[PDB]
Ligand binder design. Sequence first.
Ligand SMILES: CN(C)CCC=C1c2ccccc2CCc2ccccc21
Ligand SMILES: [Cl-]
Ligand code: NA
Lengths: 565, 565
Amino acid sequence: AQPRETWGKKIDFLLSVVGFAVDLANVWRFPYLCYKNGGGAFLIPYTLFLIIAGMPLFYMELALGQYNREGAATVWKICPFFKGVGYAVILIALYVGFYYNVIIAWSLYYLFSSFTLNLPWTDCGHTWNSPNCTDPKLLNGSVLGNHTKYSKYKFTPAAEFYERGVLHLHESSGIHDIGLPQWQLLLCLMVVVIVLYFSLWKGVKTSGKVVWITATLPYFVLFVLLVHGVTLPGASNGINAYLHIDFYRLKEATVWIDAATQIFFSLGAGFGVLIAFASYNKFDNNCYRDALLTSSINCITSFVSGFAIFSILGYMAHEHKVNIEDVATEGAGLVFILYPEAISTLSGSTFWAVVFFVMLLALGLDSSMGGMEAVITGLADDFQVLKRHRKLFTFGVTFSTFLLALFCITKGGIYVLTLLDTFAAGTSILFAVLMEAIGVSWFYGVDRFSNDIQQMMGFRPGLYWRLCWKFVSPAFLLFVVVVSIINFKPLTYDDYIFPPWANWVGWGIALSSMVLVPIYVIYKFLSTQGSLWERLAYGITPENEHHLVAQRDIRQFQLQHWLAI
Amino acid sequence: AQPRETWGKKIDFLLSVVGFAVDLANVWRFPYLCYKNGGGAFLIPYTLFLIIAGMPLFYMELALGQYNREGAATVWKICPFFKGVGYAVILIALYVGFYYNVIIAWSLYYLFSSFTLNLPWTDCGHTWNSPNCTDPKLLNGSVLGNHTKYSKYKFTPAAEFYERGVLHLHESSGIHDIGLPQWQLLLCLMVVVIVLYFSLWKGVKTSGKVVWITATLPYFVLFVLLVHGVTLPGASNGINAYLHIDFYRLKEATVWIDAATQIFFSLGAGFGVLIAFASYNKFDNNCYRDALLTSSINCITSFVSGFAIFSILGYMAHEHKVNIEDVATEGAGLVFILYPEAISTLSGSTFWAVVFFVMLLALGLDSSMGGMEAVITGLADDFQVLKRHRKLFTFGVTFSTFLLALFCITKGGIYVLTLLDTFAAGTSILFAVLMEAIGVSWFYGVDRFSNDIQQMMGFRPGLYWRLCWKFVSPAFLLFVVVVSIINFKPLTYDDYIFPPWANWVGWGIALSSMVLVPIYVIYKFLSTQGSLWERLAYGITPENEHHLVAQRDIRQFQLQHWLAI
Ligand SMILES: CN(C)CCC=C1c2ccccc2CCc2ccccc21
Ligand SMILES: [Cl-]
Ligand code: NA
């Protein structure tokens, strides 16, 4: 009926991929995975995975979504067997937006609080925060005793505003008792979901305009933070520990699960957002150049973000007493601790804080609307009734996201947020990208994919990209999944410990999306009325080429198809 | 499409409506309301409210669901402006379906525990019950004394078992800290919902056959319990106190408004279940005799169950050497705290303890199946897609009920259960039955409703039934609603007091169903196109009489319609 919708401008796609790719502000926590005796621990594995897995998977997803011109779930009409990975990545993006809207609400609350002339992080009083009053220690306001107290800095005005004034974490004991959702956080979440609905109910062109307006100057805040970090006298000590140039210090074997999760969140692999955005893209586009540009931009952004973060770390460690490693909270609120104290020192604390919070709101809204648009595109291409009624389905999705995010905005919502993020994100995106690589490279065929690319644009992927798609990336993803299943530590906060049932709940939430692949395989095997050979043929052959099943001509059965690279 | 299913035999429909009318509310509440409200003089208004206010509301649904063989919601095709109240009686049936099955779990977990020779409520200790350090005392063997009534004494083995060993309320403080759902009760709830799905997944065919067992065993259980209690020492005093005629009670407070609410919540007229059950019956079936027999069976069953209840209460009063007013209780305190404690002191306690709880299970199974089939039929006749997919829609409904009943089976779910029951049931179903009576007796017309009955069975209801449908029933429902609004008390438990925000959320849940009538009126007024008199005439006239609207012939705009009885 209605033709396939497309972008209004080609530059809109290159801006939207970055607006969804700008998550290195908050999700890039270097001191969390900081080194112990290795030096480079979150930059060597990050770059390695971006080189060997990031760019190949980005190019593969872009070309697949551009050629098939379908959603994440209906891209697997080229191999109906591995079609459960579409629902898997849809649930992945849904669970991710669930806690991403919480970060957006936190940023909105900080933006609303920063309007005051006196910032809430400039004194140790009752300035919109909730100090316990046991340790009202002004970092530079008054002289205090040099007591480390485990070198922990959680009584600073920034932390007292974050974990007590914004989150109200003191009222909740833990995951077992989360309390009631906060009213101000509820209003913030309602405003966020209303903005998302008003941005997404129109179409992809409105989302393109929104990512154009919001992502206009995200780099400027990072640039001014970096230029203020290194120019100030006492902030070089921490950044010196950051760029620890040790090529013979080794604490890991370049193996990290959090690095893979970070590259997948940055690029978008395992969420269906790349395929969904490539579906609306034009037929003739250089996905290779776009992938290289996106990877380079993400690498530079990660580098400058780590620079600024460790510069603020060293500034805190010099202007204050306790050491660098325990000065800030390593978790989902690292930037909320770092950036307010840094902006308090800089001139014009109110204006720059407002600008930084507007940037955070912009990037968060962009990423969340990208994920929600990917989910909507997938479930609309899957069910044409949902594609016809786009507004009702969008309203339903936004309302479900708002309802299922109340457990993350409550008194102890940060614990559920971290649990969901870690378990769901890591395990689900790992299994999803592994299954997608196995299906595209082996079952569908690297030769057929390369031929489709050559028919799409003149240039053909060389030996490097094909060998990465076929051998390097699937083996890497399988090894990461194995090291994640084996080397699994119990989920915990900086100080709070989770009961054993929280780990089981997280594993069950991950498995809910994981088992979506074998369930659909069994569904396809049982639905087809035929012999075992005919079932296996209908399983691993495209829908358009199903007639060849009747002609007894299947390429996957022969070993020449598998051996071909 | 294909014609809907029908009852193979009218005995199935009769037993189904009997099992729906006869539930746990006729065992724990009716005898206590009889005793407290003057003894025997409570039968004078009750039967009165049975005849003038309860019986005409039971003949109104069996004749509206048989002439218009539709669901609870879709039956409002004679007056679309009230179809919203057809949705409320569905949503209410969901709000009642969450906690009610929990009670069905309470009778299941007590059944398995009664499969041992030593019942868990016969002695003090850790016999499947969580005991206090030094608080509990033994019922028999102590002649020290007592200064408090045994109805609220929570230091007995049975009460402590019911609270801590079953509900686990000792490790909870209120709705703010409910805790995690009990797995030993989650398994019982799973078994209950599985039985419900297996009964209702293939239509009325399997439900009618399950009712043949689940609606005939409770009568045998009551018969054997009465024939055993009539020989128990001390039952004569209980029978005399239950049948004591005290005509001194002439006050409206608790004597004239308690029999009305008891009749209303015992007969079940206006819940939407009767419209669904009467939609699978033949067009020539007599609804008059069916309604009369159902009301008489309900009232006689309540009256004869009061005999066994008070025989057990008199036996316990003689054993405890206390008066009957001290061992007089209602609700779960009777069937779970008072009756098992009395069975403990009987001979062959295993048989009686198994048969009492299997009667309690059979009483709840019929009511839950009816309340769920009401929603099923109301949503299937409205949405034609759900008619073909019944085995999936019933499964979805059961799974949603199970997931939304996890807040009542937890360590502190009794408070949420009481909140839901009281607010939702009372307020929403009262407003719903009031709107239904107003729509059927005034807007549609009692003369047309009598002509429909005359076309169905051949005879037309006399002037008494029309007078009790047009004037008596609406005024009675309005009086009950006004009393419920005025005599509304703040939510409270035995000792715990609900927070101020509990009353507001309870009222919100109650209004969620009640606002569906004005919202649907506005929706119907805005959807229809034309002038005000052309949009109003399309919501008060039947869909088969809309052509008369084009001919400027509307009967609801004349004085003869409103002044005809
Ligand atoms: C026992 N007769 C009187 C009806 C009792 C049963 C229910 C019930 C039970 C289980 C599931 C749904 C429902 C919906 C109908 C309703 C409405 C108000 C109060 C109670 C009830
Ligand atoms: Cl009754
Ligand atoms: Na029953």
